[PDB]
Amino acid sequence: PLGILQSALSDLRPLVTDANKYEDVSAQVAVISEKLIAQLDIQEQTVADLLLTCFCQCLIAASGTNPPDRQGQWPTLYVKMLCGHQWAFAAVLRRMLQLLRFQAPFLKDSHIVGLAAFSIHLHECQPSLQFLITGVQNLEHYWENLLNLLCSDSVGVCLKLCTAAISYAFCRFSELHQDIFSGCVPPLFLRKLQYLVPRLIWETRGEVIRDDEEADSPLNWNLYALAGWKEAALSLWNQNRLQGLLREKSFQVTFMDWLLWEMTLKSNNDVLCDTDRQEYQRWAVNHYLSESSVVGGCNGDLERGCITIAEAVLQFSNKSHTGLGDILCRLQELICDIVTSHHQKGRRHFFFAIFYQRLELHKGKKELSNHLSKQGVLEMCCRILLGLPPLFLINTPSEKGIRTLGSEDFWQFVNKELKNLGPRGYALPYNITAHFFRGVISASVQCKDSSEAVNSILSATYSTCPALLISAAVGWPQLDPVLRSQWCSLFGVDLPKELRTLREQQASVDSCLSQGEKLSLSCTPWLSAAFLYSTVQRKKLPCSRMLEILDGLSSNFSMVLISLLFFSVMDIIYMFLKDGRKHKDLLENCVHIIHCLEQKGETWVWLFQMTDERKPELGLHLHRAASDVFLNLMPFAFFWLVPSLQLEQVVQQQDFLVIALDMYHKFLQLFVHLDSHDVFTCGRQFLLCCVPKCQKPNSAILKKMLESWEEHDPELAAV
Amino acid sequence: EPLGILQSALSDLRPLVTDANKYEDVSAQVAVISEKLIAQLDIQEQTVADLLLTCFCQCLIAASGTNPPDRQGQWPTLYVKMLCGHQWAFAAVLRRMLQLLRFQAPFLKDSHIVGLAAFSIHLHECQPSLQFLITGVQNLEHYWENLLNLLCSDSVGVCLKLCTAAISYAFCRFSELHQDIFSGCVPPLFLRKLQYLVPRLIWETRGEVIRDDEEADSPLNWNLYALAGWKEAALSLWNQNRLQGLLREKSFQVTFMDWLLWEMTLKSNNDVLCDTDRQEYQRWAVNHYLSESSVVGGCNGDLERGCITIAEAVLQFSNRHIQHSEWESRNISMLKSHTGLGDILCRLQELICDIVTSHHQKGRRHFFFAIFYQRLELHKGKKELSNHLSKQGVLEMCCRILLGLPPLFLINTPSEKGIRTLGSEDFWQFVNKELKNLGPRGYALPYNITAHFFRGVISASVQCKDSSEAVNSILSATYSTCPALLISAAVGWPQLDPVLRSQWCSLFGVDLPKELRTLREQQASVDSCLSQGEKLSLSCTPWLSAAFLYSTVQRKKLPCSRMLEILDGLSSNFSMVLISLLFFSVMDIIYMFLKDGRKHKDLLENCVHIIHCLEQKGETWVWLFQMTDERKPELGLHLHRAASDVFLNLMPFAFFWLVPSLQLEQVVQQQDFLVIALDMYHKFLQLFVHHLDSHDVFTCGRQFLLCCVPKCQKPNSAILKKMLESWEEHDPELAAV
């Protein structure tokens, strides 16, 4: 079956020497007549390399008699025959894939030219392949896959190839007006030889000289008797007809496609040393940075440069990576020229804007598919800030003869779209809450005092952006030596008065836990109850040894006992989302509640209310530090822990019923069972014994329906 | 049967060790007989090694459980002796140890590691174990670094689990005596990598120094055999008050340079830390070594010694990484993964931004440049081999560094009395000795080191009061001290203007100064008059206008005939443009020669056209060819001090191509001609020690000498034909003429 196939398919070469006078047809009829009978199986893995190779053979057979200009009426015919079938033309594609992926690094130097000429001739026939494993579209959705995988793994081959699917097309498909010629070759080959050449082959970047002695002449078809691959792709980049062709729009290269090619080329694959791979870029960036905007580029707007780089980085996420690090180093190389200038007119606002607009597209709530992309882009938004620090980009000083050091930005980004980033809820992670401190330490040099500015910053930080101090406290032990060393490195004097009170509080806590000394209180009941909580929770000590050491008689006591209830009902959850069912610390809260009762009341509902109607100050200094992933999930905890109490939760409380309903409304808007929604009866019971506004028996019968509002809104007016 | 008896013996040695049976050791001598009955990547046997090493690695863990090491016996010493007494097996086990540590580092157990660590310590105790027939290593000590400086780069989580069991075994074997001589049991190097790998991997022991003085007994009675992990066995040992008072001596002292030399070599891949976590470690360490004393090796609290010491290492780690490149004709050779380099250079700019941004600058920068004046003196001309020349691999790092910095460091910023004037005197004195780098052009620098400068003076005037009266002062002090920078702008204007303009418009929207503007005018008086022809303006300084014109021509691909017709004919500043236009063409010829050596005729025609265009005025063009400073008018120095020295060593190679292509009589009415001709021939010989051009020179510097200046009438051509003794007679002939 195949022996005769190899014979026939090999009986072609003798024909094509001089007698190529339309007789290469009946042999094609025979090829097709005998081909009728025949995971990369062996039937296909072998026939492919048999059809293809006949090309690499016949081409070289005929390229000795005459060049391709005059001959070349067989190839179109052979390829039209091949494409005439379906179960074979779909094997050559995958075979060439495997043959340029695995063996590509070393196959041959003349089994290549026998692949370009099969690419091109696969273009002038525009065949149909709508059905295939992956490629659903026409070829144009196949060249890009191949070329991209290849230039990501192997570079030298990509150029060895691109510069051979061109030279075969200025010889062939010549002698025709320059208006329709450009439709023969595909665009991407040129759109990529506009990129590779000046990367590998220097001397052609625009530095040295333009040598030209043979510019207007059909270049020699010498690839079969050549001298190297550095004069077949340079005797082409210097031909006028091409160098004047890389100006159309059908194939441009702009400063958002350069990245997505260079930002995915992993070292250990390239062919350039480090201190050349880091000159290519510094040349490129500074060539798409002095280029018009109608073309891909930005005139001189460093701002626009950084903007584009960030917008590209965000569009690649779709850990350890090497290429991305170079881009994130060029960011610094660019920015460090800004902070040392103190624009005061174009300031950090130009940057953060990007995030806000990349973070609105994912507002179309759906089936657990966009939230993921949201946090995935957010983690990258964070990784960046850690990748373009001179470490005080996040600081907005001023100038009126002095420098004030304020930071009016990064306080909104945090309060809005960063606090909902990491675990533990109320806190941030310990990789971004150190940049702010190691930044105020490093920007406190410009001023004249260097010990007062820091105090002003950290005194302002109490009102706005409190979620940073808590993230420090929760992560202080691995943060003290850092600063204690930085300061001594720069100045070498005592510390200020607002970076050591935290140390004093930690030390007091520690020295008081071992024995017990009725801990004091620094008039700040949402700080001094974070230390006290985190130390315990890390050293595994229980409750009894947590609040047994408070000395509250008339000072700030209830607040230090409510902050703990908050921090204790925001970690019942981190132990639910994290592969769990229920955690045993609610006893701590049932004890804190009894301790608040022993005092003069000091109600606890400020937490379980989302609006800002009458929530006292700390009650809205707390929720301004949480994450909207939890606050949308409190009712769960509310109805978990409530049933452990009765006969005092209402009759001596204020605004209970209202809050219970405000919650039970949201307990439904989550989904769209018996072990989760059982407080039906609970809410039904609290009514019969509550602060009777009207509540005679109406709301005891209305819970038998889905209208907690059909009559409640009016049933409150009678209060 | 060298095997059966072997396994029988190394098995009977198994149970006999659970108890320290007195005198039950001669059974070792039996293995001596067996081995004596049996005697690159060797694989001939390559099993005796494992057969003999597993004996230890198994008998140890088999006995341990009955008694701790100290009360174990005198077994391992005798074993190691019966091994080393045959210096062929001792030449193998080493090889298998290293081969299985490196290649299959992760594919190992948690019980064989200690079996190698204890064996290593026992080796160290038997120092008389010294072999010479092991290529690559002379003594024993070398082996330790040989394997560990590969382990600590290919895989870090095995240089810790192997350098902890050693200590946990030594502190259980020799922890009965040796109040002072304890130091000397373990090998030193082990006890250094710990001090570098423990904190890095785990943070709970970074900065804490003193917490208490509670006395301890010993680690948990050799718990490694049934440990619960390593984060607590490496931590129950860092606190042992007997150790922390041990890594203070000199032979266990890590330092700063010795740290950079190890962090650079970490492969980014195969590491264990995410890229956003191995930069906190560095941002901490760099600060932990700046607050120290110099006796330890760390800085004393300053910052200069913290940058000098990071540059002096990059200029010392690349030397062993020449790492050339080639793509066509690929020789299969993997590339070294992304080294920790770069990162270090990012923690070096977070530190320069803290001594230029301050309130007490006193902006001196003599340092950081005298550090480069040394590596270029280690091998000034040649390191006995032309592989890493000055302008090859050291002047490409004095740039990779000098770029990653801000564009302000290159400028001084004095603050004498708060006035804060501007200037530069340590980048000029230095760029006048790094222009020799760019051999491509010769009359220019590269571009990426010409933007920063012009982009710096603009980011420094800010600090001053009038941000547009210093620039006019700098760029006027220039034109007389550092020409080579402008001519690299002229050659690059159309890629540079939309940066300066945008910057000066983004800081504060005020009109430009009178020195970043003159250039736009001198460029627009060109890009137009080349179109359709009008005239040229001929601003004050010639050698800048000429650069503009010549480079613009080259960039637009025009011929070399417009350049000569759009020009004044009655101006006093005409010739001084043509001279420069000749100089640039010469240099272009010379560049074309150092690229597939040839001549590129057309330029030889351009130059003769120029010489004829300036010959009907009575001037003197033969003083470019004076490689001295004797009498060259001031226009010569301001050009030669911009030209590389790779080229002026070739100027003769271009003086005998376009001299004979002139008339034989219009190159003699000049002043002191032959004094350059023969003074250049003298240099045309030193090059040989092209070759076909020796004839044209031997004749052209031989026929002129008859109808030449009134210096000699005879015996000078005869003398020149005598031999290469032009000097022996010229030294006396020049006396008169």
XYZ file of N, CA, C and O in Angstrom, chain B residues 19 102 120 202 205 222 288-289 301 315 526 531 728:
52
model
N 25.155 -2.636 71.869
C 25.850 -2.514 73.141
C 27.331 -2.288 72.882
O 27.908 -2.878 71.963
N 24.235 16.389 44.753
C 23.968 17.405 43.742
C 22.800 17.015 42.843
O 21.765 17.690 42.826
N 30.728 12.871 57.802
C 31.588 13.992 57.449
C 32.366 14.490 58.656
O 33.568 14.770 58.565
N 13.581 31.512 57.935
C 12.605 31.654 59.010
C 12.863 32.966 59.734
O 14.008 33.277 60.078
N 13.809 34.535 64.148
C 15.116 34.706 64.767
C 15.959 35.721 64.011
O 17.172 35.540 63.865
N 18.985 13.739 71.033
C 19.181 13.204 69.688
C 17.846 12.786 69.073
O 17.657 11.644 68.652
N 21.143 45.563 58.468
C 21.789 44.915 59.599
C 23.305 44.918 59.486
O 23.987 44.785 60.509
N 23.848 45.074 58.282
C 25.290 45.123 58.092
C 25.824 46.541 58.000
O 27.045 46.725 58.001
N 28.192 52.401 60.320
C 27.024 53.260 60.401
C 26.914 54.273 59.284
O 25.933 55.029 59.255
N 31.638 44.304 40.315
C 32.834 44.339 39.479
C 33.787 43.199 39.770
O 34.934 43.224 39.310
N 18.224 73.611 9.079
C 18.782 72.524 8.287
C 17.677 71.706 7.629
O 17.631 71.579 6.405
N 15.550 70.762 2.027
C 14.420 70.713 1.112
C 14.450 71.963 0.242
O 14.437 73.083 0.759
N 67.098 57.910 12.257
C 68.536 58.092 12.426
C 69.056 59.298 11.655
O 70.056 59.906 12.055
